[PDB]
Amino acid sequence: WTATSGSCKGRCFELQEVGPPDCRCDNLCKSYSSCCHDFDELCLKTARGWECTKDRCGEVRNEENACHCSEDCLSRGDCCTNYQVVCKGESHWVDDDCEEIKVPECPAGFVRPPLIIFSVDGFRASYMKKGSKVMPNIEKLRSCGTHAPYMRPVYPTKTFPNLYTLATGLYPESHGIVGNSMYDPVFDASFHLRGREKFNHRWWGGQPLWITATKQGVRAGTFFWSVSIPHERRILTILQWLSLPDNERPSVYAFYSEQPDFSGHKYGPFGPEMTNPLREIDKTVGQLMDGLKQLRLHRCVNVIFVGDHGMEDVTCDRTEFLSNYLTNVDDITLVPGTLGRIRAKSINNSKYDPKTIIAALTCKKPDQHFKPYMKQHLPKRLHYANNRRIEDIHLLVDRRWHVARKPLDVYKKCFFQGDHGFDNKVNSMQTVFVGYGPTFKYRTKVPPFENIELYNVMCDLLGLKPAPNNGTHGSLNHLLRTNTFRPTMPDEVSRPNYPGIMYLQSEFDLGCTCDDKVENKLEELNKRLHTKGSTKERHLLYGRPAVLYRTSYDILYHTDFESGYSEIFLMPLWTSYTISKQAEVSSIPEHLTNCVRPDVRVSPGFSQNCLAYKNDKQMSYGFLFPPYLSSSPEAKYDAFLVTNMVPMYPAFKRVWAYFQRVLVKKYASERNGVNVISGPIFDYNYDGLRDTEDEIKQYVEGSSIPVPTHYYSIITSCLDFTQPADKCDGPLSVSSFILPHRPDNDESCNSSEDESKWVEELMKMHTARVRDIEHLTGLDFYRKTSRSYSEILTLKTYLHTYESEI
Numbered sequence: 001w002t003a004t005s006g007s008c009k010g011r012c013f014e015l016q017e018v019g020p021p022d023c024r025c026d027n028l029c030k031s032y033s034s035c036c037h038d039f040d041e042l043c044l045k046t047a048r049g050w051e052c053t054k055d056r057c058g059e060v061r062n063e064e065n066a067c068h069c070s071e072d073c074l075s076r077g078d079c080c081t082n083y084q085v086v087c088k089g090e091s092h093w094v095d096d097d098c099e100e101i102k103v104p105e106c107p108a109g110f111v112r113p114p115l116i117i118f119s120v121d122g123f124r125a126s127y128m129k130k131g132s133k134v135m136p137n138i139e140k141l142r143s144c145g146t147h148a149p150y151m152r153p154v155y156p157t158k159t160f161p162n163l164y165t166l167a168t169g170l171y172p173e174s175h176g177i178v179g180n181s182m183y184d185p186v187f188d189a190s191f192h193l194r195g196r197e198k199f200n201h202r203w204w205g206g207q208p209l210w211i212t213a214t215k216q217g218v219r220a221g222t223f224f225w226s227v228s229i230p231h232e233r234r235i236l237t238i239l240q241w242l243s244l245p246d247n248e249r250p251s252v253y254a255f256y257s258e259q260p261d262f263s264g265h266k267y268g269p270f271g272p273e274m275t276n277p278l279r280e281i282d283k284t285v286g287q288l289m290d291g292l293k294q295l296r297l298h299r300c301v302n303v304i305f306v307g308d309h310g311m312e313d314v315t316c317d318r319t320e321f322l323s324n325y326l327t328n329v330d331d332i333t334l335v336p337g338t339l340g341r342i343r344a345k346s347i348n349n350s351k352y353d354p355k356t357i358i359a360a361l362t363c364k365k366p367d368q369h370f371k372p373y374m375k376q377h378l379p380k381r382l383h384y385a386n387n388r389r390i391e392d393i394h395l396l397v398d399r400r401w402h403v404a405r406k407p408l409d410v411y412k413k414c415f416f417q418g419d420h421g422f423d424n425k426v427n428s429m430q431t432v433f434v435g436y437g438p439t440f441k442y443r444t445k446v447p448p449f450e451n452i453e454l455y456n457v458m459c460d461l462l463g464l465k466p467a468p469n470n471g472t473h474g475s476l477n478h479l480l481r482t483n484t485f486r487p488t489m490p491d492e493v494s495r496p497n498y499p500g501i502m503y504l505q506s507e508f509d510l511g512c513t514c515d516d517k518v519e520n521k522l523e524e525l526n527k528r529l530h531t532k533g534s535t536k537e538r539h540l541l542y543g544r545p546a547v548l549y550r551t552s553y554d555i556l557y558h559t560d561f562e563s564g565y566s567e568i569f570l571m572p573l574w575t576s577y578t579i580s581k582q583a584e585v586s587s588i589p590e591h592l593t594n595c596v597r598p599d600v601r602v603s604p605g606f607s608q609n610c611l612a613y614k615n616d617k618q619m620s621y622g623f624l625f626p627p628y629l630s631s632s633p634e635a636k637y638d639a640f641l642v643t644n645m646v647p648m649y650p651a652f653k654r655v656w657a658y659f660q661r662v663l664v665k666k667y668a669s670e671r672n673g674v675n676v677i678s679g680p681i682f683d684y685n686y687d688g689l690r691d692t693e694d695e696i697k698q699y700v701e702g703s704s705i706p707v708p709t710h711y712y713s714i715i716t717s718c719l720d721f722t723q724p725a726d727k728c729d730g731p732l733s734v735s736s737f738i739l740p741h742r743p744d745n746d747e748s749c750n751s752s753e754d755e756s757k758w759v760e761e762l763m764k765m766h767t768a769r770v771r772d773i774e775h776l777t778g779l780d781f782y783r784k785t786s787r788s789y790s791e792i793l794t795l796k797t798y799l800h801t802y803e804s805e806i
């Protein structure tokens with residue numbers, strides 16, 4: 001119930017929301033059907049439209065009018081945005097040459113530059129170029145301010161997941177808005193785009209910017225705007241707020257546009273009908289900027305222009321139907337569209353089995369336009385798993401396609417030509433970022449970055465301490481003129497041991513054999529030095545990774561590679577090695593095929609054993625430093641040390657061998673040497689965070705050798721590829737992967753073909769930021785470079801997407 005017999009007289013768009021059942025006047029009252037009777041009358045004035053005209057200049061104040069052209073309007077803060085242009089001979093902000101804003105040029109009383117977040121739905125990245133002719137205001141913001149060629153949204157590339165990620169710096173799996181549509185089994189409740197449940201606070205995790213602000217004594221304008229409050233009124237309200245007395249005036253504001261998303265669904269991302277929506281958004285921008293200029297704030301305020309996601313071409317005829325794969329279609333609930341999520345229709349059905357469903361959706365048709373996945377086998381880069389609201393079964397749908405349950409759903413629910421929600425690395429899902437203001441840089445292009453990083457920066461722009469979030473604070477310092485956040489390297493928690501030769505061959509009973517016993521102070525002094533770390537400057541280019549947790553490990557030095565060996569997990573946490581451009585690939589010799597050698601630096605008790613691999617009929621093994629890339633026949637003996645060995649399914653060995661035998665050399669050619677750090681990852685609880693010992697769900701049979709869930713590699717070279725990796729004087733270039741350690745290759749539909757046809761594709765699908773790998777390992781890389789930490793932070797957040805050009 002709401003008693004709507006109160007009035008909004010003087011209360012229009014009140015910031016402090018009043019509790020039921022007294023009527024509401026805030027920008028959300030329409031959505032809750034709870035406005036005061038006079039809300040339309042007082043708060044949604046429209047009389048005479050949105051622009052001053054020559055005859056309206058210096059008029060008598062008429063309180064009915066939407067905006068004003070009277071002499072007093074500037075004081076009252078309620079002129080039409082074009083008032084000075086029409087009545088005082090001022091130019092539009094867009095027609096003014098842009099000039100560097102070296103410092104905040106704010107009215108007295110302003111304790112800090114305000115921040116206005118101008119957010120646009122479905123604003124695809126390529127619109128900045130392709131629609132630049134029709135977008136003069138926006139195009140002026142872009143080129144005079146700071147801009148990225150695109151901004152990477154989060155998966156799924158929908159609205160609420162993205163807008164709330166912007167507001168929180170969190171992955172949807174952490175903030176809770178994991179889709180446009182959701183069921184929470186604990187609440188036994190549902191979240192939809194329409195209706196009212198979505199307004200319950202319990203869906204919304206983390207701390208959004210407005211709450212971070214308020215808790216820290218910084219006032220906020222409200223962020224959420226009902227669809228029926230026209231754009232012009234939203235702008236006027238923000239301008240009005242900006243004129244409030246110092247003690248009442250908000251410091252952070254948001255504008256929202258339903259366009260271009262709305263039209264792009266109807267007409268597709270490039271439908272000729274798309275020009276108009278883009279014209280109108282630009283007109284809105286021009287109004288804001290004109291409004292700001294009038295108020296002497298256009299060189300004081302920091303403006304962010306940001307989209308939530310892009311838009312792709314998607315029509316009805318391009319749907320896949322689960323009914324063409326599944327017999328049991330009515331025993332399941334599918335969340336449909338540009339992503340699939342599947343659960344049982346009823347929890348009382350004990351015959352339901354995810355295993356058989358996945359299998360029935362796997363590589364069943366030739367050009368199949370989606371791929372099923374247990375959520376924990378989704379590429380780790382999507383961080384889309386650690387939430388009870390995300391169904392165990394997920395379908396990654398091909399760009400340009402839809403998945404529905406049955407054909408009837410598609411014709412009884414072509415209507416649309418555009419849609420979004422696909423994998424976040426997909427070009428058409430990319431969105432925009434422009435920062436313009438005193439705190440942003442002047443005429444600066446920055447590289448593509450992820451929207452999860454904005455929360456931090458908006459906190460910086462406001463002088464706020466950010467709530468704990470998924471951004472890497474400092475990785476976007478290069479966007480900023482001042483207010484940068486200067487982070488320290490995390491302190492190392494565990495210092496390594498440096499074991500010497502402390503065990504005799506005969507103390508090891510691991511069931512390992514190696515045909516190695518074929519025997520000079522020239523090459524005997526040389527090898528000691530190698531085992532003391534003589535070649536370490538070559539293979540450990542950026543210093544050793546720091547272990548950021550309490551554990552017990554050893555640094556092991558070799559001719560061709562260096563490792564941090566875990567006595568707890570009985571394998572390396574990392575193996576580091578440099579492959580120069582000229583380096584040569586050799587084979588594993590016949591007499592060495594099944595050779596495994598005891599490491600006389602590491603005790604039997606802290607070693608793996610060959611017997612456990614013999615007994616484990618499913619588990620085989622691989623090596624972290626590839627024997628194929630040994631520098632000499634004599635050095636190759638080190639590749640076979642038990643302390644270089646890791647557990648590997650024969651299905652995964654196919655992948656690993658091809659990467660180690662073929663791809664590393666290829667990269668070294670193409671990049672002028674590469675440095676490689678490889679290792680295991682354990683994430684059985686799929687929270688994207690390093691597992692403790694007691695979280696491991698699988699061991700090599702009969703042993704305490706834990707089985708990795710994933711295998712990572714970090715591949716570094718010189719950004720200037722004319723300089724070889726080991727003699728790089730400037731910025732670095734990185735690409736990385738986190739491969740799932742799976743006992744089949746069901747994921748790659750072409751795995752029965754040669755590795756050259758499918759492996760590299762899989763790696764690309766599982767591209768990763770170094771930062772992802774840090775989360776998963778508790779390591780901290782790049783501890784000793786000549787580079788600035790902020791640059792190294794940006795590097796660590798870099799993702800190599802393998803998409804073609806924007």
Ligand SMILES: *[C@@H]1O[C@H](CO)[C@@H](O[C@@H]2O[C@H](CO)[C@@H](O[C@@H]3O[C@H](CO[C@H]4O[C@H](CO)[C@@H](O)[C@H](O[C@H]5O[C@H](CO)[C@@H](O)[C@H](O)[C@@H]5O[C@H]5O[C@H](CO)[C@@H](O)[C@H](O)[C@@H]5O)[C@@H]4O)[C@@H](O)[C@H](O[C@H]4O[C@H](CO)[C@@H](O)[C@H](O)[C@@H]4O[C@H]4O[C@H](CO)[C@@H](O)[C@H](O)[C@@H]4O)[C@@H]3O)[C@H](O)[C@H]2NC(C)=O)[C@H](O)[C@H]1NC(C)=O
Pocket residue numbers: 170171173174175176202203204205206383386387388468469470687688689775
């Ligand atoms: C991305 O960034 C985020 C932000 O940092 C990272 O997530 C954090 O990770 C922390 C480590 O997992 C985690 O810390 C835990 O907090 C528990 C208390 O949490 C409540 O309070 C916080 C603070 O305000 C709040 O943020 C939480 O909100 C979550 O939960 C509610 C649901 O109730 C949601 O509405 C909300 O969206 C959010 O959900 C998400 O996080 C939870 C984890 O809390 C997930 O489970 C959800 O699926 C969802 O994704 C909470 O309101 C605290 O209880 C934990 O302490 C336990 O574990 C430690 C281990 O150190 C142990 O010492 C303690 O004894 C305790 O264990 C006891 O309970 C256990 C289970 O109940 C049991 O096993 C034991 O036997 C004990 O009885 C823990 O400290 C922090 O909450 C989240 N924060 C957020 C916002 O998500 C995330 O890691 C980053 N991702 C990546 C890849 O880097």
Ligand SMILES: Cc1cc(OCc2nc(C#N)c(N3CCCC3)o2)c(C(C)(C)C)cc1C#N
Pocket residue numbers: 031117118119159160163164166167168209223224225226227254255256
């Ligand atoms: C800029 C910004 C805007 C914003 O909201 C703008 C907004 N209002 C409505 C309404 N009605 C709406 N819907 C999206 C699709 C249906 C309606 O979206 C939000 C939140 C509040 C969504 C979390 C966060 C940020 C951030 N950061």
Ligand SMILES: [Ca+2]
Pocket residue numbers: 121122158159160261308309
């Ligand atoms: Ca949207």
Ligand SMILES: [Ca+2]
Pocket residue numbers: 682683684685686687688689690691
């Ligand atoms: Ca984990």
Ligand SMILES: [Cl-]
Pocket residue numbers: 156158178179180181335
């Ligand atoms: Cl969804």
Ligand code: NA
Pocket residue numbers: 613614615616617618619620
């Ligand atoms: Na085996």
Ligand code: NA
Pocket residue numbers: 745746747748749750751752
């Ligand atoms: Na396959």
Ligand SMILES: [Zn+2]
Pocket residue numbers: 122261262265420
């Ligand atoms: Zn949309």
